[PDB]
Amino acid sequence: GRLPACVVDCGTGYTKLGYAGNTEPQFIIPSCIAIKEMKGVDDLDFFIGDEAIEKPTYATKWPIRHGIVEDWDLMERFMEQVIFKYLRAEPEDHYFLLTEPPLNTPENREYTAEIMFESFNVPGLYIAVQAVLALAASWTSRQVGERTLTGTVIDSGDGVTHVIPVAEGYVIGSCIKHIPIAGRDITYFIQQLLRDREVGIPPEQSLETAKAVKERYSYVCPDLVKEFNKYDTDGSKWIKQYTGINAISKKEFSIDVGYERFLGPEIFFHPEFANPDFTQPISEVVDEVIQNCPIDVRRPLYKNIVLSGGSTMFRDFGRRLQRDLKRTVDARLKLSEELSGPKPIDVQVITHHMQRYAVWFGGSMLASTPEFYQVCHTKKDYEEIGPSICRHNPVFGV
Amino acid sequence: PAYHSSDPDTKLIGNMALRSQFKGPAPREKDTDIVDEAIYYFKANVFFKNYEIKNEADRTLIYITLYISECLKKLQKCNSKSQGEKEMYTLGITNFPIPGEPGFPLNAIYNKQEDEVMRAYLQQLRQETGLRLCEKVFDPQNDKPSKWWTCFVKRQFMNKSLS
Amino acid sequence: MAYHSFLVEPISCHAWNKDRTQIAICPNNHEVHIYEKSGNKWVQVHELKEHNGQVTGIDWAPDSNRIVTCGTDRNAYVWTLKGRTWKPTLVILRINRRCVRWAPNEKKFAVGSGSRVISICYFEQENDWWVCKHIKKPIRSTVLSLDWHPNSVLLAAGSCDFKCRIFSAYIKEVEERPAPTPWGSKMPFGELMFESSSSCGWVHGVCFSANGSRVAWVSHDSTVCLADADKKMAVATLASETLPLLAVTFITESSLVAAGHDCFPVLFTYDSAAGKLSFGGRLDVPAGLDSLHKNSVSQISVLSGGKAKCSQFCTTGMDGGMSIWDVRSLESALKDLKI
Amino acid sequence: QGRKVVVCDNGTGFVKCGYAGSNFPEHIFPALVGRPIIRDEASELRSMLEVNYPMENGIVRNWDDMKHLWDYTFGPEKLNIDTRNCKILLTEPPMNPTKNREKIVEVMFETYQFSGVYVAIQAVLTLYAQGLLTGVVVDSGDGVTHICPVYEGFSLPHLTRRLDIAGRDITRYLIKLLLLRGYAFNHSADFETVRMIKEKLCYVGYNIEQEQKLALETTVLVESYTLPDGRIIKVGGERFEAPEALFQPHLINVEGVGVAELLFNTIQAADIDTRSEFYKHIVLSGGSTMYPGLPSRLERELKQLYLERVLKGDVEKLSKFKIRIEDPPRRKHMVFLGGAVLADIMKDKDNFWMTRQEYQEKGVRVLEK
Ligand SMILES: Nc1ncnc2c1ncn2[C@@H]1O[C@H](COP(=O)(O)OP(=O)(O)OP(=O)(O)O)[C@@H](O)[C@H]1O
Ligand SMILES: Nc1ncnc2c1ncn2[C@@H]1O[C@H](COP(=O)(O)OP(=O)(O)OP(=O)(O)O)[C@@H](O)[C@H]1O
Ligand SMILES: [Ca+2]
Ligand SMILES: [Ca+2]
Incomplete structure (x- = not known):
């Protein structure tokens, strides 16, 4: 009111x-949320937010x-x-x-x-449903021309990245696919990479430092050969330097950020790198999700591909996604047109301003x-x- | 996807025969070489676990890579460029793996003259790889091995290893 | 004293073979299972998934080697062995709505159900099809338990109408005439020859004797009632301190054993002299239960010996255990039990 | 002697074909023509295939699909017999156009060039298996729930009503109902899935007030069910409220009074000398007649509409009215068996069957009707 x-x-x-x-x-x-290691107002002594991450008298729990x-x-x-x-x-x-x-x-x-x-x-x-409002947030990139509740939304976060097909506000559970690579797994990949590459980093600040590397310097590349050859041949303009402060000694600790910045963001385009129990790339997952759903809404799902969550805010992610998707699509179209004794399949991966x-x-x-x-x-x-x-x-x- | 190897009339030995100073069953070698080609995409395929065979050359590239892994694992403790070269000669002189002998971790994938030519080509390839890598591994500063190359010391290519 | 753990759920019906070589049972499922005995361990051999609901009644004609089954599927299946597969034949029950038992003649079966009509059924060889005539006279409720007499012409059944009637389902086109019985002279299809006097409790149990002289039944009013036509159709009831009995059968001509919600097989003897029933006691003396089965008994057939001198009693209950009993071991255990 | 006779029922959604005399169908396949777009045989692959139905609501829409459907029905998959050397018997729906009936025999004499043909009314064939002359055959398949009245081997086309509520509509009702319950399913992707769930746990209750009471108050109507994805949903009262549209067609925004009200208003609208006869013989045939608890509800509402209108409040004068409906155990395909019986009976009976020579000489409309 x-x-x-x-x-x-x-x-x-x-x-x-x-x-x-x-x-x-x-x-x-x-x-x-912070908790005790019970009667009265014992439940009133509860701290949430950032003021609970590093409690020492209490215990930090995840819900x-x-x-x-x-x-x-x-x-x-x-x-x-x-x-x-x-x-x-x-x-x-x-x-x-x-x-x-x-x-x-x-x-x-x-x-x-x-x-x-x-x-x-x-x-x-x-x-509310997450993807329902997500397609609406994606309707705040494209203005009034095409603001619809039809499309395929891929929500990637710290816990789980999922590909959910959305149709007129109604999601199609039978077509929804789950992905294994999440923000925490990419952060962890950065942690291991940094753990194997250089030393002189406190273990009590390793994870946070890795997260920082995933935040500031992390960027997805187009090829896995050039992003390394540019670091091997040049390595003067590419390799960045990161400076942090060890919470223990309050001293300036320093590390060198390089190939990891490409690898971490590359973990989505190739899950085979850090998961033996997963061989499917995101392109194939999206393709199967769009294909295992209704055929009449398939074009609409392939048209409105909306990125939701924090793990999708990485640079040039949707570009590579749309590239692989349109590649496989054009390939299958050519294969179908070679044995045809077909219209152009339009595909678009939308990048919203508040896609985070x-x-x-x-x-x-x-x-x-x-x-x-x-x-x-x-x-x-x-x-x-x-x-x-x-x-x-x-x-x-x- | 994964990476593969880039002639019509080219000799072959077994399931897999493509510029070094070491003697071997190797033919004369253009500007780029199989060793150079293997060294080019070395840091990439190491993280990859799954891989498909498209050409016979891919098996050779896989062998050169698997050898490069042990070569770097040995070069990890190097203290001088000359020491690295000597250790490279020692690695090239080593003989512990064979096609379907006591375990190549890929015996399911891959005469006397053929075996001799294969072994000779193996020693020549290992020596070439060691010699070629020995120069790029050490930095101009303090004649020590670079960390940006010793980074892949723990990772194993195709989840298999020669050692 | 031989209980075998077959399943975790309850049991519906218990049937046996001619030479008692194989046993058939249903586990409250849309299918019926048939298991045999090869050594100390039992193994399933046949499976029939013809019915379209929970199976209620099943009986196997021994001499005919042919088992008929009817349940919630509102249909009857006269299954006969065809080579290596038991072929079922859909015998139309013709009912708009829980019991089945072949006759001693093994030619026609009675299907008592909730249609308030004991649906007798014979096989017409002229049309190569089973026909089911329905006896509904003086019937007000479902037929819980149905048991034949030795005459194979007069059937007995307990109803939810708090009574156990003994009517006649004799089809004069499938057998010869019936001799004069002590239960009456006039025996016609649909004619009520006998009935109960109880006005309380449901007659879950009903079984006739081997001599065909006496017909007993168990009521759900914690009371058992046996009638004898030898003494002008005299009715003798008795109230059990235990819970209600579910199944009732006679071991001897004057000694019957029965179990039920008491979850413990009990023995009883009725003296023809005084003309009253007496309690023998607990034949089953030893989760947390004080008996073999952890639930109420659901059926109790005879393995071998007849209703005059049973040598082995077969007991199926809601406990999922097959209780094989012997009169010899039971008499050797309880020395204070007079059969 | 007659070169193997056969019987084929080509319904709206499910086609059932069997040899003449067979107590059941020898082959039951889903009626759908499938086509590919990339570089029960069709129902298995529908997620990535373009499916079309030749017979729409009983009538044929695409003859180019129906022809291939017939070639697949008489193909080496289900029948595997030569059409030129074997007779057949097809099933037709009530209130069918003469043009359709003509085109049928026309395509059965020219395209297939059959040597024998024998068409019959489904409303008549459904009662034929029951062995009667006068009765009410009500068919509720996947197309429409048509109520047909038959008497002495004939059906009054002015007495044949129809309710636009079918098994497909039951499916849609269940799928719509589950959505409100908290779950989520797709309108096209999980169609067959919803149809299966409905076929499984759903039903029709006698006392809607008492059933709603048992559902709201007690937790005994609620049953669980596992889906293909592995996840499980628990449906309760939705089981009955979904099929309840069969009794009151106002629950799905449809024009009508209900199957019970239709049957009752079509019963009292008959001859008074036949009113006591047609109310005692009603045959239930169709896929929607396998819903557990339809018979009791039909009897009850039929009892209501002949005690509030026929008896007009007279309670004592209600018992006199006969009320007997028979829900046969093989009512799931009485149309097929009824043919399988007829085709077995009139196999070599005289010459009362359409011939090829009589279809090649003259008269594509050679129909003694
Ligand atoms: N600047 C950034 N660029 C890319 N990724 C980031 C950035 N900052 C954080 N992340 C990653 O995003 C993840 C959190 O994303 P997000 O907020 O979408 O998930 P969530 O909503 O918290 O959890 P869920 O997705 O289960 O609802 C973190 O694991 C982090 O690694
Ligand atoms: N057990 C069941 N209970 C209720 N409905 C069912 C059951 N099994 C199948 N059905 C429904 O029956 C319908 C098909 O029935 P059927 O094959 O008898 O008619 P049809 O021949 O397809 O239709 P028509 O005769 O109108 O062309 C299906 O839509 C299905 O939803
Ligand atoms: Ca989220
Ligand atoms: Ca039909």
Whole structure:
């Protein structure tokens, strides 16, 4: 009505919270909560966000595993501190739009509804799909010409990278494919590479340093021969230097960043590098996902390829993706046209401006519309009918 | 995908026969060579585990690479360029692996004269690889082995090894 | 005292072969399994997946070597052995709605069901097809347990109508006439020859004697009632302190054994002198259960010996255990048990 | 002697062919012509194949597909027999156009050049297996649920009604219903999957109020089921509410009163000397007649509509009304067996069957009807 609702997307590696309508998140915290190693207000002594990553008197726990919730009570306390300590907004005087995973169970949605409605007494509640809002965030790259709920969305994060086909707001579970290489695995690959390449780095800061390498200098290349020959022949303009501070001695520690910057980002285009139990490249995964779905919507899925999540913000990822996809596509088209005794298959990998946090952007764009007040399940309907009132979320905005 | 090897009338010995000063069953060698070609894509295929055979030359490239792995693993403890060259001669003189003998980890993939020619070509190839790598491995500063080349000391190509 | 762990779920029906060489059973499934005995261990040999629901009744004609089965599939299957495969034949039951047993004549079978009509069925060789005539006179509920008499012309059945009636399913086109019985002279298809006086409890159990003189039944009012036509159709009931019995069969002409919700096979003897039933006691004396089966008994057939002198009693229950009993070992164990 | 007679039922979605006399069908294949676009034989591969149906709602749309369908039905896959040296018997749907019936024999005499042909009414053939002359044959397949009234071997075309709710519509109802329950399925990708789930756990309840009560209150109607992807869903009341559209066609936005209301309004709309006869003999044949609990609901609603309108409140005068419907055990394909019986009976009976010479001499409409 007069005030604004709150939006909160809980990811595996990072939780994004803020107010709907805003340009960016009001607080983008870490997906971890502090706990004790019980009666009274023992549950009130809970710290969440970045202020829990390195607690020493408490224990740092992780709740959101691979997009799905593992321990409910912990996530409850986390949402508590997210509501009161981080947002500090009146819950009874505000609505809320929560995000779900691609493989979110119905019973899980029911439980989330219970925790949000019974304990918080929220005036509004809406459980949305990630890819649904993602395609909408991708509809904020292309203006008004082609803003549709049809397309194939690939959401890569710290926990799990997935390829989910979306059609008119309705996802096709039978076509959805799961990928093994996630942001944490690329970060880990960088950690091992840096562990094998140079020394003089404290073990208590190794992982963070690796993450830094994945953040600042990491970039995906086109070929695996030239990115190494340019480092072997030149190596004066390519090889970068990284300087950090050892938290232990407060001294300036230094390392050399090079081939790893290409390798880590290359781990997606080739999963065979760091996984013996995975041989499929992302191109093949997307191809099979588009092919194992309805044929009538296949062209639309191949047309609107939307990148969502943080692990897809790496440079020139979608370029190589679209390259391989269009390559295989043109190849198959030629093979089909050689034995034909076919129209041009258009393929486009979209790169949104907020492709890092698209799941939350789409939610903020959905919650800003008047329809979100009509679509969101009311507290009244929740108390009158039951939890089943939050079991099916309507899709509008088209 | 993975990398492969780039004549119509070319002699062959067994399942796999393509410029060095070491004696062997090797023919005269153009500007680029099989050793140079193998050294070109050495740092890349090492991380790759899966690979497909497209030409007989690919087997030779795989052999040169698998030899380069042990060569670098031995060059890891080098302290001088001359020491690296000598160790290269020692590696070239070594004979511990053979096609379908006591385990080449790829005996499923790959006469007396043929065996002799194969062994001679193997010694010549190993010597050529060691000699060629011995110069590029050491840096101009402090005559020591470079870390950017000793980085692939732990990684194994095609999840197999000669040692 | 020989219990064999076959499955974890309950058992529906227990059937045996002619020479008792093979045993057939269903595990509350859309299919029926047939297992044999090769040494100390048992192994499955045949499997029939013709029925389209949970199998309720199954009986094997010994001399005919042919097993008929009928359950929730609202159909009957007169299965006969064809070479190395048991071929089933769909015998139309003609019912708009849990029991089956071949006659001693092994020519026609009674199918008592929830259609409140004991559907007798004979095989017409003129049309090469099975026909099922339905006896529904004086029937108000389903036919829990159905057992024949030695006459093979008069059938007995307990109903959910709190009574165990003994009617006649005699088809005069499949056999010769029936001799005069002590249960009456007028024997016609559909004619009610006998009935119970109980107004409480369901008659889950019902079985006639070997002499055909007495017909007994077990009611779900924790009471068992045996009737004797030798004393002008006298009815003798008895209340058991234990729970209700589910299956009832006679071991001797004056000694019957039965189990049920009590989950323990019990023995009893009825003195013809005084004209009353007496309790023999617990023949099954030893999870947390004080008996072999961890649930209620569901069926109890005879292995060998007849209903006058059973040498071995076969017991199937809801425990998933095949309970093989012997009268000799039971008499050698309980010395205070008079048969 | 008659060079092997046969019987073929070419329905909307499922084609069932069998030899004459067979108590069942000797081959049952899905009716779909499949084509490739890249460089039960077709149903296996449908995710990457363009599938088309020749027989739409009973009628043939694409003859170019129907011809190949016939060549695949008489091919070496299911029948494996020469059309020029064997007779056949086809099944037709009620209220069919004369043009369709003519074109059928025309294509069966010219394209296939069969030496023998014998068409019959499916509404008549369905009762023929039951051995009756007067009865109500109600067919509910994948195309449409047509209710046909038969009497003395004939069907009144002015008495044959039809409800636009079929097995396909049951599938769509189940797939739509599951979506609201919390799960998610595709409209085209998991079509057959949803059809299977419905065929498995779904049903039709007698007391909608009491069934809704048992579903909402108790947790006994809820059953679980595993999908192809490995994941499992638990469906409860959706099992019955999905098929309930068969009784009340207002639950799927359709014009009509319901199969029970249609049958009842078509029963009282008959001769008063035949009203007590047609209400005691109703044959249930069709794929949608295998739903566990349809018979009881039909009997109950039929009892309602002849006690609120025929008895008009008179309770005592309700018992006199006869009520007997027979849900045969082989009701799943009574049309086929009924043919398999007829074709076995009139195998060599006189000469009451269309001949090739009579189709080559004169009269493509040589039909004694
Ligand atoms: N600047 C960057 N460029 C590329 N990748 C990054 C960058 N910063 C962080 N990442 C990677 O992105 C991952 C987190 O991505 P994201 O926020 O999409 O996942 P999430 O939403 O926290 O979890 P989920 O995807 O399960 O919901 C981290 O593992 C990190 O390694
Ligand atoms: N056990 C079942 N319960 C309910 N419906 C079923 C069952 N099995 C199959 N069906 C439905 O029956 C339909 C097909 O039935 P059937 O083959 O008898 O008719 P048809 O010949 O395909 O149609 P038509 O005769 O109208 O051309 C399918 O759509 C399917 O959904
Ligand atoms: Ca996410
Ligand atoms: Ca049909």
